[PDB]
């Protein structure tokens, strides 16, 4: 928060009634399991719990007051009563954002939101020479609760901000972009694999363009079939386009190449100038993500060497498609952190991109249909599937003849010890499968 707020100065702005003593808070929490001194607790209802049941707990941990939508009789701390706590949270987020005066960029899309966010954050942090001065959305806190929680983290040390906006329903981004009011808005794409109908998806992403600053820059994907609709909706605003295919885009990539790890490198071209960029990430889609981040960074005033350095400094998250090369010349992709069926299919797509022998190495997801569909999707796409775990017995069957189930990791590892250079191996499983032990044994 840019400054502590006083409950009695919010009755008007939140349409609230103060019950009990006045209080001043310098941060907010929506969770009794993660709150401490000086903080406002916000009581939300969900499918599993009701926040209003935890007032004793938050008072004991030092919360100064609770924002509630029903009065709790004889509460152990002051209450600020409103009709809808989701909307009061939204308003608090908007109010904090209006105190912040630095550059703010936002991005939406079907896929690549988080990655463009980390890329852009890396660029701005690299240019500033300090990580703490750039606020970015933590994890995936991007929905109608996540966004105002992120905006509430805006604080006196921040100089710029990078805000992820999720669009899984119509009107969600219309609401969150109005709280956020970015200077630059990015749409990565609409309608990518494994992610309301196509026209709804296009309309939902485009909502970002409505909250954009009046001469704010729109960053748009010239390859996307919805480009012309997004361009119209962007109305007057300055526009920067990116593309892997078109010479007239503002940001372009030439001469795409993988390094020995499999990570993508390219020549950046366009209006920021030309340079070679070596990412630490896999997949052609991450080149498009880099161009979108570069475009935004350029709109914000970052020079070329800041863009390049920021893109090259970004590392993958541990166990999230980390490509490495063993001393034996084996390519091992560590994706052992976690897995769900959708993430499995995204993994398989990455692996099928490689041209020599490909070995998919799987542990169980933490049921039968899903394993079944994962193995089937892999079939005809990678050279082999090695797996461990009883649910993974269903994947191997659906995969076919070069698929092998193993009794424990120990025999899986002995099999992989036999693979030669030019082979790519991808290792993935739920956290409970502990497939990082296989990674460690090879690397």
Identified binder of Mg ion from the candidate list 52, 97, 113, 125, rule CB under 5 A: 113
- Tell whether residue 140 is among the known ligand binding residues: yes
Tell me if residue 213 falls in helix, strand or coil: coil
**In the structure encoding, which two tokens stand for residue 18, read together?**
């103060």
Nearest residue (CB) to ligand ANP, 10 versus 179: 179
> Does the protein bind ligand ANP through residue 109 (CB under 6 A)?
yes
- Tell whether residue 112 is among the known ligand binding residues: yes
Nearest residue (CB) to ligand ANP, 115 versus 122: 115
| C-alpha dist (Å) from residue 100 to 1, 103, 161, 182, 320 | 9, 9, 9, 11, 33
What phi and psi values does residue 180 have, to the nearest 5 degrees? Answer: -85, -40
- Tell whether residue 110 is among the known ligand binding residues: yes
Tell me if residue 70 falls in helix, strand or coil: coil
Nearest residue (CB) to Mg ion, 140 versus 235: 140
Q: Which does 346 bind (CB under 5 to 8 A by kind): ligand ANP, Mg ion, none?
A: ligand ANP
> Does the protein bind ligand ANP through residue 192 (CB under 6 A)?
yes
Residues 103 and 340: their CA atoms lie apart, in Å, by 36
Cβ-based neighbours of 259, under 8 Å, separated by 6 or more = 265, 278
- Tell whether residue 386 is among the known ligand binding residues: no
Task: Provide the phi-psi class of 108: left if phi over 0, else alpha when psi is between -120 and 50, else beta.
Answer: beta
Contact 187, 229 (CB under 8 A): no
Q: Which does 146 bind (CB under 5 to 8 A by kind): ligand ANP, Mg ion, none?
A: none
> Does the protein bind ligand ANP through residue 319 (CB under 6 A)?
no
Helix axes 113-128, 285-299, angle to 10 degrees: 50
Binding segment for Mg ion among 79-87, 97-105, 112-120, 413-421 (CB under 5 A)? 112-120
Contact 50, 30 (CB under 8 A): no
> Does the protein bind ligand ANP through residue 336 (CB under 6 A)?
no
Identify the H or E element spanning 25: strand 24-25
> Does the protein bind ligand ANP through residue 285 (CB under 6 A)?
yes
Query: Which residues on neighbouring strands pair with residue 160, listed in sequence order?
Result: 134
Contact 165, 108 (CB under 8 A): yes
**In the structure encoding, which two tokens stand for residue 262, read together?**
């499999």
Residues 185 and 238: their CA atoms lie apart, in Å, by 11
Residue 58 CB coordination number (10 Å): 26
> Does the protein bind ligand ANP through residue 111 (CB under 6 A)?
yes
> Does the protein bind ligand ANP through residue 122 (CB under 6 A)?
no
> Does the protein bind Mg ion through residue 326 (CB under 5 A)?
no
Q: Which does 192 bind (CB under 5 to 8 A by kind): Mg ion, ligand ANP, none?
A: ligand ANP
> Does the protein bind ligand ANP through residue 288 (CB under 6 A)?
yes
Residue 332 CB coordination number (10 Å): 25
> Does the protein bind ligand ANP through residue 114 (CB under 6 A)?
yes
- Tell whether residue 229 is among the known ligand binding residues: no
Q: Which does 122 bind (CB under 5 to 8 A by kind): ligand ANP, Mg ion, none?
A: none
238-267: contacts with ligand ANP (CB under 6 A): none
- Tell whether residue 283 is among the known ligand binding residues: no
Residue found under tokens 């300055």: 238
> Does the protein bind ligand ANP through residue 115 (CB under 6 A)?
yes
- Tell whether residue 114 is among the known ligand binding residues: yes
- Closest distance between ligand ANP and the C-beta of residue 111, in Å? 4
Query: Which residues on neighbouring strands pair with residue 220, listed in sequence order?
Result: 241
- Tell whether residue 45 is among the known ligand binding residues: no
Q: Which does 285 bind (CB under 5 to 8 A by kind): Mg ion, ligand ANP, none?
A: ligand ANP
Q: Which does 111 bind (CB under 5 to 8 A by kind): Mg ion, ligand ANP, none?
A: ligand ANP
- Tell whether residue 366 is among the known ligand binding residues: no
Nearest residue (CB) to ligand ANP, 52 versus 125: 125
Identified binder of Mg ion from the candidate list 32, 111, 114, 176, rule CB under 5 A: 114
Cβ-based neighbours of 292, under 8 Å, separated by 6 or more = 107, 112, 116, 119, 186, 188, 219, 221, 242, 251
Nearest residue (CB) to Mg ion, 114 versus 126: 114
> Does the protein bind ligand ANP through residue 137 (CB under 6 A)?
no
Helix runs in 4-54, H state only: 11-14
Kindly state the number of chain residues that form the binding site for Mg ion, as judged by CB under 5 A: 3
> Does the protein bind Mg ion through residue 140 (CB under 5 A)?
yes
Nearest residue (CB) to Mg ion, 140 versus 257: 140
DSSP state string for 72-102: PTT-SS-EEE-S-HHHHHHHHHHHHHHH--S
| C-alpha dist (Å) from residue 188 to 58, 167, 295 | 40, 12, 12
> Does the protein bind ligand ANP through residue 166 (CB under 6 A)?
yes
- Closest distance between Mg ion and the C-beta of residue 164, in Å? 6
Give, as one character, the DSSP assignment of residue 236: T
> Does the protein bind ligand ANP through residue 346 (CB under 6 A)?
yes
Q: Which does 109 bind (CB under 5 to 8 A by kind): Mg ion, ligand ANP, none?
A: ligand ANP
Sites of contact with Mg ion (CB under 5 A)? 113-114, 140
Q: Which residues are annotated as a binding site for Mg(2+)?
A: 114, 140, 164
């Amino acid at each position: 928060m840019l400054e502590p707020l006083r409950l009695s100065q919010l009755t008007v702005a939140l349409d609230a009634r103060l019950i009990g003593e006045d209080a001043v808070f310098s941060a907010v929490s929506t969770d009794s399991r993660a709150i401490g001194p000086g903080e406002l607790f916000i009581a939300l209802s969900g499918p599993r719990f009701d926040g209003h049941d935890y007032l004793a707990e938050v008072a004991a941990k030092g919360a100064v007051a609770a924002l509630v939508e029903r009065e709790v009789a004889d509460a152990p701390l002051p209450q600020l009563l409103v009709r809808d706590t989701r909307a009061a949270l939204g308003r608090l987020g908007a109010l904090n954002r209006r105190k912040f005066t630095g550059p703010l960029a936002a991005m939406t899309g079907s896929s690549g939101k988080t990655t463009v966010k980390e890329m852009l954050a890396s660029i701005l942090r690299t240019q500033a020479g300090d990580a703490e001065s750039v606020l970015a959305t933590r994890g995936n806190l991007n929905n109608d609760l996540g966004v105002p929680l992120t905006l509430l983290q805006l604080a006196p040390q921040h100089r710029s901000a990078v805000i992820e906006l999720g669009a899984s329903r119509i009107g969600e981004i219309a609401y969150t972009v109005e709280l956020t009011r970015p200077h630059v808005a990015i749409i990565t794409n609409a309608g990518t694999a494994h992610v309301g109908g196509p026209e709804k998806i296009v309309e939902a992403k485009g909502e970002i363009l409505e909250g954009l600053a009046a001469d704010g820059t729109a960053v748009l994907n010239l390859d996307d079939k919805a480009f012309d609709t997004w361009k119209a909706r962007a109305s007057g605003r300055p526009l920067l386009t990116f593309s892997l295919d078109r010479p007239q885009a503002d940001f372009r990539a030439a001469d795409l190449q993988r390094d020995a790890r499999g990570c993508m490198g390219f020549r950046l071209q366009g209006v920021a100038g030309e340079a070679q960029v070596q990412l630490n990430l896999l997949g052609r889609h991450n080149v498009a993500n880099a161009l979108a981040a570069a475009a935004a960074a350029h709109a914000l005033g970052v020079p070329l060497d800041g863009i390049v350095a920021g893109l090259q400094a970004l590392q993958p998250v541990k166990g999230r498609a980390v490509a490495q090369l063993t001393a034996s010349g084996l390519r091992v992709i560590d994706d052992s952190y976690n897995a769900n069926p959708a993430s499995m299919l995204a993994a398989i797509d990455i692996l099928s991109g490689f041209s020599g022998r490909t070995v998919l190495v799987l542990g169980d997801m933490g049921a039968e249909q899903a394993h079944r569909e994962v193995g089937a999707y892999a079939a005809g796409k990678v050279s082999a599937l090695y797996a461990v775990g009883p649910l993974m017995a269903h994947a191997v069957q659906a995969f076919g003849a070069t698929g092998r189930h193993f009794a424990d990791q120990a025999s899986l590892i002995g099999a992989l010890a036999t693979e030669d250079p030019t082979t790519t191996i991808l290792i993935k499983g739920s956290r409970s499968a502990a497939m990082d032990k296989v990674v460690a044994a090879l690397c």
